[PDB]
């Protein structure tokens, strides 16, 4: 997405403070709890039938970690989101059948997790910028679809 300098700074300042070990698996975990049909894509990850299973499943974490540094990739290539996400967009939208509406859903879970982690510090203004980011990713991840 193209957010300004100001915005690219609200974003990177706190992204520097993120635990890249727990943040992704917890957004991926939450995605699996809050939107339980996303469960179908991850049948192989073992047992997803309960809140705490999901949350404690080891495989969820590991792949969450991979989701979130793929967001760290988006942040370093922040103005060719299409190109940096051309491999993942064909993957998800072709080999896996992920309805792109689920792209938008994951970035919102992550936003709530961001808010959950940082609290008062995750200001509306900070969110607003992070909405541009997630929307951007969501949209780049759908490019070789729409």
């Amino acid at each position: 997405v193209h957010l300004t300098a100001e915005e690219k700074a609200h974003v990177s300042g706190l992204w520097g403070k993120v635990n890249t070990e727990e943040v992704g698996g917890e957004a991926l975990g939450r995605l699996l709890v809050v939107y339980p049909w996303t469960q179908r894509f991850f049948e192989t990850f073992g047992d997803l039938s309960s809140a705490n299973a999901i949350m404690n499943n080891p495989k969820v974490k590991a792949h969450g970690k991979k989701v979130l540094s793929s967001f760290s990739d988006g942040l370093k290539n922040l103005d060719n989101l299409k190109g940096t996400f051309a491999a993942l967009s064909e993957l998800h939208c072709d080999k896996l059948h992920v309805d792109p509406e689920n792209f938008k859903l994951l970035g919102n879970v992550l936003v709530c997790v961001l808010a959950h982690h940082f609290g008062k510090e995750f200001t509306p203004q900070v969110q607003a910028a992070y909405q541009k980011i997630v929307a951007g990713v969501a949209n780049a991840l759908a490019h070789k679809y729409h």
Partner: protein, 141 residues
């Protein structure tokens, strides 16, 4: 469709919010106008500055309204008649806007009570705001 575990979770989570009701509704709105500015156009009357006693008061209406909602999880259509009348007949509010505000409420609640905002609670309360929204966007008068 809320389950009884959904009801327990919204009921438990909502009074933990409590007096800070009014104050979180206001933050949930401010957060909405900020991240999603097209939704400012619904309140062209309003003072939408960052101070706003107005955004605050209205922020108190929302919070109250949702309390009403948690008191009658069994009959949302019936408790939410008049508000549906308003948001659907009179303001004709586009359904995307309840989803923005709804999401903005979650960011807010999560930034204030991280201990109660468990993965399950998150799930029940999203179903809830998704169910109150449908009432407020449907016409059944």
């Amino acid at each position: 469709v809320l389950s009884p575990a959904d009801k327990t979770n919204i009921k438990a989570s909502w009074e933990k919010i409590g007096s800070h009701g009014g104050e979180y509704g206001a933050e949930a709105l401010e957060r909405t106008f900020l991240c999603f500015p097209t939704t400012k156009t619904y309140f062209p009357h309003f003072d939408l500055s960052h101070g706003s006693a107005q955004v605050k008061a209205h922020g108190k209406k929302v919070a109250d309204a949702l309390t009403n909602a948690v008191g009658h999880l069994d009959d949302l259509p019936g408790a939410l008649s008049a508000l549906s009348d308003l948001h659907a007949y009179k303001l004709r509010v586009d359904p995307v806007n309840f989803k923005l505000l709804s999401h903005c409420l979650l960011v807010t609640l999560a930034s204030h009570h991280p201990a109660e905002f468990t993965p399950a609670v998150h799930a029940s309360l999203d179903k809830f705001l998704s169910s109150v929204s449908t009432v407020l966007t449907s016409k059944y008068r």
